[PDB]
């Protein structure tokens, strides 16, 4: 029987996903990391936090492959205690809604919304079949402030994320008797790899107070929030949405 809880972090080898994986490992979780390709240096780095880490190749959009991925995780770890739905993408192209291509809408919906929904389904079947439950359990979905704030130049992104908000509410109800805490986390403007030109612009916007807290969010901010929710103290808060955005999404006049 497992002695550490197991977190499956989709898209966990870079960016926000990696910040989440690091926070969870530090809190005492073992880690199943998925992505289209691995990074062995990152897996090694995560093992340095003192737990077990394994990588599983998965395309989130390829829903026919999800059950096999879940079985691989089960075969390696025995069970799943926390799912973090982090994998996602931005819009393929930004621009006028009038120029939005159905093909690009499809690509993002298939990843962010359809893929996440069915990956979650596959994991939940396994969680509901677990013959023992020794750790707090959770499903934490990383959507976006774009779930609730609209950006007309990228409505495909916004719609895909708003879909997740609705999904999470239903999922919370479905899993309430099983005592699996179901949460949404909405990141705002989180630091990414950037050119000086772009970073200087964002920094001026942030310092100007676009973000009330007047700083970049870090992957570690999202990570600490997620690890907080995964530790079990928020079980009775199932269905809650947390905005990891420095106050960006506060409606202000």
Site for Cl ion in 151-180 (CB under 5 A): 154, 157
The answer to whether 193 is a known ligand-binding residue is: no
* Minimum distance, C-beta of residue 114 to its own copies, in the bound complex (Å): 7
77 touching Cl ion, by CB under 5 A = no
Answer for which of 45, 49, 89, 90 binds Cl ion (CB under 5 A) is 90
Distance CA 121, CA 113 (A): 12
Distance CA 169, CA 183 (A): 8
What spatial distance separates the first Cα and last Cα of the chain, rounded to whole Å? 54
CA-based radius of gyration for the chain? 18
119 touching Cl ion, by CB under 5 A = no
The tokens describing 110, both together, are 């298939």
Cβ nearer to Cl ion, comparing 15 with 90: 90
Cβ nearer to Cl ion, comparing 10 with 160: 160
Widest pairwise Cα distance in the chain: 55
Cβ nearer to Cl ion, comparing 30 with 245: 245
* Minimum distance, C-beta of residue 75 to its own copies, in the bound complex (Å): 21
Distance CA 202, CA 227 (A): 28
Cβ atoms of residues 188 and 249 within 8 Å: yes
The answer to whether 30 is a known ligand-binding residue is: no
Cβ atoms of residues 176 and 232 within 8 Å: no
The answer to whether 190 is a known ligand-binding residue is: yes
Q: Which residues are annotated as a binding site for NAD(+)?
A: 13-14, 16, 35-36, 59-60, 86, 161, 190, 192
The annotation places the binding site at 13-14, 16, 35-36, 59-60, 86, 161, 190, 192
């Amino acid at each position: 029987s497992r002695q550490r809880p197991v977190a499956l972090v989709t898209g966990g080898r870079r960016g926000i996903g990696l910040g989440i994986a690091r926070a969870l490992a530090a809190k005492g979780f073992d880690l199943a990391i998925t992505d289209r390709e691995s990074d062995e240096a990152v897996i090694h780095e995560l093992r340095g936090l003192g737990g077990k880490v394994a990588f599983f190749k998965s395309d989130l959009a390829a829903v026919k492959t999800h059950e096999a991925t879940v079985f691989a995780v089960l075969d390696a770890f025995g069970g799943i205690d926390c799912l973090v739905n982090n994998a996602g993408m931005g819009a393929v192209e930004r621009g006028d809604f009038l120029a939005l291509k159905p093909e690009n809408f499809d690509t993002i919906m298939d990843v962010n919304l359809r893929g996440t929904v069915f990956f979650t389904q596959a994991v939940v079947k396994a969680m509901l079949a677990a013959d023992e439950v020794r750790f707090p359990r959770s499903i934490v979905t990383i959507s976006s402030v774009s779930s609730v704030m609209t950006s007309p130049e990228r409505l495909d992104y916004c719609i895909s994320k708003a879909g997740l908000t609705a999904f999470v509410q239903g999922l919370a109800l479905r899993l309430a008797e099983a005592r699996i805490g179901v949460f949404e986390v909405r990141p705002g403007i989180i630091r990414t790899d950037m050119t000086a030109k772009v970073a200087a612009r964002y920094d001026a916007l942030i310092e100007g107070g676009l973000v009330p807290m007047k700083r970049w969010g870090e992957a570690s901010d999202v990570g600490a929030i997620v690890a907080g929710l995964a530790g079990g103290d928020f079980i009775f808060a199932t269905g809650s949405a947390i905005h990891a955005d420095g106050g960006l999404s506060i409606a202000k006049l």
